[PDB]
Design a protein around this ligand. Sequence first.
Ligand code: HEM
Length: 133
Amino acid sequence: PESELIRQSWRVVSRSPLEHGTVLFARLFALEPSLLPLFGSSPEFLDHIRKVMLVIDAAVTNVEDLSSLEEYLTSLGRKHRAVGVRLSSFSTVGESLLYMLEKSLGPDFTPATRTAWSRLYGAVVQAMSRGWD
Ligand code: HEM
């Protein structure tokens, strides 16, 4: 019931991944402008947006069994720690993801859809958090 809400809402976003990823990152810097220096240039920034959207694509494909990605996501967390990202900043990324989905879906972004996404994103960050251990 939750795996279908995620798949169906992600299909709408998948129609334009850099456009939607760009809304997510614009929200992220509005909330936590201190993050912007962690990036490099414009092509590096835009390519990172594509990389984030591909990781969420993999999380959506594996939504019924995210443990199959836990080692990959742990390594991703280690890489983010290595380049100076604080684990706390991932809560603001989650708020920015839910913002971008609400703007993309409007009234189709039901509380059940939001809650499903909150849980999926939380499982992704729980796996990544191991990289800060
Ligand atoms: C505040 C949040 C974040 C910051 C500051 C950040 C920053 C970075 C930086 C500096 C890199 C290395 C340079 C690069 O490849 O462009 C990187 C790599 C990456 N990030 Fe992020 N990141 C954030 C959140 C995320 C999230 C939430 C995901 C996925 C859900 C993600 C996916 C990636 C991927 C796939 C890479 C490439 C790793 C590799 O080469 O093996 N990022 N990120």
